[PDB]
Design a binder for this molecule. Structure first.
Ligand SMILES: [Zn+2]
Ligand SMILES: [Zn+2]
Ligand SMILES: [Zn+2]
Lengths: 446, 446, 446
């Protein structure tokens, strides 16, 4: 019954992990936080499906699925520079444990590898060297882990016409990219991300700048005058770097109901099953034939606070403004309810937040100044609404229909509220190994 | 299981060593701090590789590898005045322990030395007298320790075409030389460094000046009017002096992915595995054939604070300004979060820092005045950003495209943030013993 | 294992001796401080070299080496008025212990003396009557103790061509004479020194003046108008007087690497191995053939504070100014960090220092007024730098290249900093007994 995590016992992340999985009993026994979430997510999926089922693994590392008693079929294309290391590590643990266990199948996995090694285009029960689109093995359940570089409707179609009914997806929350922020943080998982255009800023999580005296004139022949989010984004998980795309990240922010219309029509649902401080598990059920009705709305439930505000910084010497997002723990948000009734300065908000934080800290200190600035702008915009009050049921657009728009500098989603976004829901258009590496793999299994 | 370090038990460096190696259990049993980091770094590498592997040692001292049960092949060119002492010390411990151990190979190492002594250009299993480029022995794993005077892409190529797949590098953090500072400190390892041009300053860690009355006129015929970093730099580790080069230090600040393009193409990765207050361990994997894509970005994760500011000093009598860098412990940085919300004078910052330090001191007292001055300049530049706020999404470069650059006097990287630097990622161009010493070595082994 | 010193147990010098020799266990059992440092320095050297080695002693007193089990060859020229007393004391202890010990060679030393007594120009295993240059015995290890009146490169050459590879030097720190001070103190060893020109001052450690009423006119025909250090200097160790030379003292302040170029070329290193409040042990390794590269820099690491300031005094009735140096304990320096943030008067600095000193005193009270005056001048010159701040990377030498030099009245080297000096590193030019005493020596051994 009990489940054990490989983290400490005095940390604050233990309680969050407990309350994210309330049907387990997690016990204690810069990547441990992300590991344990992934450990409990795989355990949940197994408990959720009947055994003796064929399980696909899209873009996997087979060394993690080797010691499990389930019909795993790992898919390992050569897409990144870290992939041959994943393959080579598998070939070692297979040889290094080729006779020490007589319960789980270990000799069959050895034969599959050396068959694919000999014949590099053969589909085998527990291995292949294809993508998620070109693989031809039939199954019923698919699993994704940290897969951010594929189009979700196109990938999900190609698993459907091969008999998959149930899919999961583990990874970072996609909500900050639907609000279109320029940079942000996932502070509990040691992660910062930023747009390419602001990598030379000064006071965000992921940046680097220089010392300078400054000129009163810097002529240029090229004039931008426009600073908006672009497609390419950089992630830093600890000290590991990952480039990603906005379009492919947003495509995994799926609505409640959507239809896939190809040569075989399907009707699909998407629900969020786990949620812990910026890391989520999604579940997608699929079924043949198109029926029901779609609205095109996606909903996010907020167990902690979500913030997004305007900041001023210097980027390569030039002063500019853009938006930053972050997550705030629920206990901190509850204890600021009284203070935000009136207008408070950013300096006084900062001192109050530091006092509330000394309870070891609840939140990281490098995000405190931008959180204190968002809270005071939110309290000021609430007062202005109350002092400029309109008539019930009446928009006053007045002689020609031209109305005035107000300025909004903070978006604050309190705990127990919900975001709702209008997205697309009808989908119809669906657009390595070599001898030196081959020889090295074959040599170990010999 | 447990690992023991040769340092005290009441020092503050024990905790830092513990939290830098969280998968060990370090126990207590001006160079002890640097020793223990190097002891645990070698222990980690051995645990990371399967035994019965051939291990190279670039620019080594064989007396340290003598008592280890691994296939070490030491490489010892005669490049510095301290090298013949390293050779002579080996020849003593070999004779001095030629019959007292019957477990580790000791007689084979004796034969290799006297073979090279007789024939000074023979490659032997456990010794040679070549550089890292001209050696011709084949292996699979290479190790570097305190190697600062070689070009990294050129050295790493020549280990590749001889079958090396895995390399490590231990040494000082290269981040201060990518920010291009003029001087700096590594206070936990008793080290200061400085540019040649500022050796006659007054108030930095490594300098020396004179008493003088001062003239109102000192005519010169040569006019410099330009003070910028130059290639040659001096290091002082305790009281030992080392000259180094900026270009060769910066070349070990490698990106996540890079390609080596010679007569045998390779694709390479670089990750940072350990990090403790300015001393790091890097790991480089390599593989044949070129594949994947490169961005050219290098990332540093900051577990403690990193500072860099402008200071004013007198150099040989003349008042000037330049930049200095240092490291600040994380506990000190966290406790200044509240104070830096407002504008504070350098004098008041200094008094607060002294109070926080008396907890034996957390940080060395000679760096406190320059840290207190950086903190107050940072707090002032944050206020100016907040009071000169722009419009969202708009650069205001105005009739001809000429914008104003602001002045930046402090760079402050708080704990849990990351630096990101654009470096080069495609590499294609890859450019002693004598009789009196010979006789002395041969005499001992006789 | 344990080592015992002949000093008390409640003194503050015991802790300093402990932390200067951290690999020993010193235990308690106006010259005791200097004795014990010399006792532990000889013990270290023996532990550092393999036994059955021939050890030279340059300018020695053989009565100290008589009871030791090592191949000592004492060298005793008749250079000073205290030398025949050293010889006569040896001749007594030899006779006085000619039959009471049957372990260490005592009869062989008796024969060597009476052979040299009979034949005054014979080289013998354990005695000779030559200088360090004219002696012709071959050996491998040399030792110097309190040798201040020889040229170091010339002396070290003549030990090289006779097969010496390893040399040591014990004595006073040479750093104050590289800064060119006019007078100074070594307060923990009961020593003061001064230049000949200031022996008639009033308020320094070593001086003497008169009572006078003073004239408003004292005509002279000779005009000096220049007061600068000259070669001859006087030392007072307790109440014993020693005259020395600046040039010969400075020649033992050797760089990290230097070359000796004679009829037999050598390459040499110099490291500082022990350091305790002004007394040091140096180690010099030497090797044949010239190789490597030299920079010409010498480095001093400061474990305590080092001060040097301008003082005003009366010398033979006339008011003048000159520079004085001293050493300050590290605990005192740490506790003044807060105070020196602002500007403090000399009177208020003095009262604070007296309060901190009553912890028996940490430092001698006669040096307190000049230390308090240096600290307040240093704090004032730091404020002026901060209020006259320049532009980064720019010397402003302005129409003709003539810049203004500032006044410097204090040099303060804090604990954990390093001095660095440019010295010469290439060396190529290398420029008694009578019957009444003879009869007296011979009579005892008869
Ligand atoms: Zn497949
Ligand atoms: Zn070799
Ligand atoms: Zn002699």
């Amino acid at each position: 019954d009990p489940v054990y995590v490989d983290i400490d016992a005095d940390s604050a992340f233990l309680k969050a992990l407990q309350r994210a999985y309330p049907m387990f009993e997690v016990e204690p026994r810069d990547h441990a936080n992300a590991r344990a979430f992934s450990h409990l997510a795989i355990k949940l999926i197994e408990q959720e499906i009947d055994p003796d089922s064929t399980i696909l693994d899209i873009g996997s590392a087979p060394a993690r699925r080797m010691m499990s008693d389930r019909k795993y079929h790992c898919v390992c294309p050569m897409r990144s520079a870290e992939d041959p290391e994943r393959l080579a590590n598998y070939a070692r643990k297979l040889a290094s444990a080729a006779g020490k266990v007589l319960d789980r199948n270990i000799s069959g996995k050895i034969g599959d590898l050396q068959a694919v090694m000999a014949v590099p285009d053969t589909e085998t029960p527990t291995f292949c060297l294809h993508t998620d689109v070109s693989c031809r093995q039939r199954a019923d359940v698919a699993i994704y882990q940290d897969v951010y570089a594929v189009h979700a409707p196109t990938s999900l179609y190609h698993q459907a016409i091969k008999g998959v009914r149930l899919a999961y997806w583990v990874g970072f929350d996609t909500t900050p990219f639907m609000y279109n922020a320029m940079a942000g943080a996932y502070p509990s998982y040691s992660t910062n991300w930023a747009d390419e255009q602001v990598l030379k800023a000064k006071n965000i999580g992921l940046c680097s700048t220089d010392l300078t005296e400054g000129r009163r004139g810097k002529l240029s022949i090229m004039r931008g005058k426009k600073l908006e989010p672009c497609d390419r984004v950089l992630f830093s998980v600890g000290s590991t770097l990952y480039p990603e795309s906005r379009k492919l990240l947003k495509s995994w922010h799926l609505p409640s109901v959507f239809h896939l219309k190809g040569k075989l029509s399907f009707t699909c649902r998407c629900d969020t099953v786990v949620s812990c401080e910026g890391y989520v598990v999604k579940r997608i059920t699929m079924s043949p034939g198109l029926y029901g009705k779609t609205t095109g709305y996606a909903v996010t439930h907020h167990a902690d606070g979500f913030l997004m505000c305007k900041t001023t910084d210097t980027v390569d010497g030039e002063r500019v403004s853009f938006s930053v997002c972050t997550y705030v723990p629920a206990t901190i948000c509850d204890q600021m309810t009284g203070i935000l009734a009136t207008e408070v300065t950013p300096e006084d908000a900062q001192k109050l937040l530091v006092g509330l934080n000394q309870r070891t800290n609840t939140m990281k200190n490098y995000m405190i100044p931008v959180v204190a600035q968002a809270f005071s702008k939110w309290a000021k915009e609430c007062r202005k609404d109350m002092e400029d009050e309109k008539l019930l049921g009446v928009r006053e657009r007045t002689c020609l229909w031209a109305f005035k728009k107000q300025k909004t500098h903070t978006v604050y989603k309190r705990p127990d509220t919900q975001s709702i976004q209008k997205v697309q829901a009808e989908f119809d258009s669906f657009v390595g190994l070599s001898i030196p590496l081959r020889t090295r793999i074959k040599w170990l299994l010999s």
